[PDB]
Amino acid sequence: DDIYKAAVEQLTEEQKNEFKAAFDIFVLGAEDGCISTKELGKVMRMLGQNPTPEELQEMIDEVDEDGSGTVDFDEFLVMMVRCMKDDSKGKSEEELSDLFRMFDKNADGYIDLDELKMMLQATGETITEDDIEELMKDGDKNNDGRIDYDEFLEFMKGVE
Amino acid sequence: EAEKAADESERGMKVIESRAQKDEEKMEIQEIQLKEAKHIAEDADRKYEEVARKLVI
């Protein structure tokens, strides 16, 4: 999603200075050979300002998900995006509204549970303990089984 | 009289030299201490933001 655009916009002025200065300060080498392939934590330490942890965790996991374990120029941009606020910031709430509109193209007065059933079916994600639990919990945010608009509205928001 | 005065003047000069050296030592020690202080301050600040978030939720 917004990941590639955030990487592209990293070509800027404030984050360019941030990346260059970070490299000049605490990316130098001349170690004992421990291979700081995990210098992500070192950079988090040497930042002087830690951003919200979601950036850190998404970078820790999703980067080199194949197990590359290495940070490139583009991955330097990824880490620096993690440093500044290059986030999509919850995407567009217009997109959330449009999605919920497509959900109630049947116009159930709310996104029905079977909307979620078919959407998970399309996504094909394995039905774990998280699956079905999340759907019922969002629908039964009243804990009464009635799915309302604001329930899934806040369920989907805050995410990119 | 002039030679005795020279000896005493050199005495005072050397005393001030040594005192200034001690002061420079204390200056650098307080300097590293101040940097440590700033870092502790930033860590506390981050913790504060975090706990505020949690409480709001």
Curated annotation (Swiss-Prot), chain A:
CDD domains: EFh. GO terms for biological process: cardiac muscle contraction; diaphragm contraction; muscle filament sliding; regulation of ATP-dependent activity; regulation of muscle filament sliding speed; response to metal ion; transition between fast and slow fiber; ventricular cardiac muscle tissue morphogenesis. It comes from the Eukaryota. One of its GO terms (cellular component) is cardiac Troponin complex. SMART domains: EFh. This is Troponin C, slow skeletal and cardiac muscles. Belongs to the troponin C family. Ca(2+) 2 binds at residues 104, 106, 108, 110, 115. The modification Phosphoserine is found at residue 97. PANTHER family: MYOSIN LIGHT CHAIN 1, 3 (PTHR23048), TROPONIN C1, SLOW SKELETAL AND CARDIAC TYPE (PTHR23048:SF47). Cardiac muscle Tn-C can bind 3 calcium ions per molecule. Domain I does not bind calcium. Pfam families: EF-hand_7 (PF13499), EF-hand_8 (PF13833). Ca(2+) 3 binds at residues 140, 142, 144, 146, 151. GO terms for molecular function: actin filament binding; calcium ion binding; calcium-dependent protein binding; protein homodimerization activity; troponin I binding; troponin T binding. Ca(2+) 1 binds at residues 64, 66, 68, 70, 75. Troponin is the central regulatory protein of striated muscle contraction. Tn consists of three components: Tn-I which is the inhibitor of actomyosin ATPase, Tn-T which contains the binding site for tropomyosin and Tn-C. The binding of calcium to Tn-C abolishes the inhibitory action of Tn on actin filaments. Residues 15-50, 51-86, 91-126, 127-160 form the EF-hand domain. Keywords: Acetylation, Calcium, Metal-binding, Muscle protein, Phosphoprotein, Repeat. InterPro entries: CALM/Myosin/TropC-like (IPR050230), EF-hand-dom_pair (IPR011992), EF_Hand_1_Ca_BS (IPR018247), EF_hand_dom (IPR002048).
UniProtKB/Swiss-Prot annotation, chain B:
Binds to actin filaments in muscle and non-muscle cells. Plays a central role, in association with the troponin complex, in the calcium dependent regulation of vertebrate striated muscle contraction. Smooth muscle contraction is regulated by interaction with caldesmon. In non-muscle cells is implicated in stabilizing cytoskeleton actin filaments. Homodimer. Heterodimer of an alpha (TPM1, TPM3 or TPM4) and a beta (TPM2) chain. Interacts with HRG (via the HRR domain); the interaction contributes to the antiangiogenic properties of the histidine/proline-rich region (HRR) of HRG. Interacts (via N-terminus) with LMOD2 (via N-terminus) and TMOD1 (via N-terminus). Induction: Induced in stimulated quiescent cells. It is found in: Cytoplasm, Cytoskeleton. This is Tropomyosin alpha-1 chain. The chain holds residues 115 to 171 of 284 of the full protein. Transmembrane segments: none annotated. Residues 2-22 are annotated as: Disordered. It comes from the Eukaryota.
